[PDB]
């Protein structure tokens, strides 16, 4: 239609800027990264945003609300993703044997 073609345009053309993530990663490493790191790390974070919004619209469709996304559907989105191990936290030393 005429909205699906505009939505497909924003699904492809949108990206995080490489001039800021290269500034963001290098504040964590200390020295330097490469261009093929920033190209991949800018691409995984678009999949991760698409992992949340496609699942936060499943929370909103499950409850009785409309397309505008309140933060109620966004804290619930991170809760359901973390219970399936999708959201990694490297500060919780987990233990499976008890």
């Amino acid at each position: 239609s005429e909205e699906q073609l505009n939505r497909y345009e924003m699904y492809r053309r949108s990206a995080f800027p490489k001039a800021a993530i290269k500034r963001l990663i290098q504040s964590i490493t200390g020295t330097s990264v490469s261009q093929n790191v920033v190209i991949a790390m800018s691409g995984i974070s678009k999949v991760f945003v698409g992992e949340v919004v496609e699942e936060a619209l499943d929370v909103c469709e499950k409850w009785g609300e409309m397309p505008p996304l309140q933060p109620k559907h966004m804290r619930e989105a991170v809760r359901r993703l973390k219970s399936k191990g999708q959201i990694p936290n490297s500060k919780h030393k987990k233990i499976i044997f008890f």
Binding site: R7, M10, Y11, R12, R13, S14, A15, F16, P17, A20, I21, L24, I25, I28, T29, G30, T31, V33, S34, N36, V37, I39, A40, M41, G43, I44, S45, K46, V47, F48, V49, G50, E51, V52, V53, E54, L57, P67, P68, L69, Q70, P71, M74, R75, V78, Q86, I87, P88, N89, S90
Partner: protein, 87 residues
């Protein structure tokens, strides 16, 4: 901290079905989630492989388990190589 992903993330939520005009608080939650994800991936990458260096190989091992993200990384790298060859 200011918001470094305020205008970029509003295009992306529209790209996955949200609205043309999302809420500022929802955009803020998404920005915080993206920063936390990038930080976690960078620490694990520094630990795995060459200590103190984050490489594409380390990032690929880290994302190997999740199918959607692994496929995207492989496609982007292959397309980048193809574009360099075309140039």
């Amino acid at each position: 901290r200011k918001r470094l992903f305020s205008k970029e993330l509003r295009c992306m939520m529209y790209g996955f079905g949200d609205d043309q005009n999302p809420y500022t608080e929802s955009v803020d939650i998404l920005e915080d989630l993206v920063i936390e994800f990038i930080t976690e991936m960078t620490h694990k990458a520094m630990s795995i492989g060459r200590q103190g260096r984050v490489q594409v190989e380390d990032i690929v091992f880290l994302i190997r388990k999740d199918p959607r993200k692994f496929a995207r990384v492989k496609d982007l790298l292959t397309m980048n190589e193809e574009l360099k060859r075309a140039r």
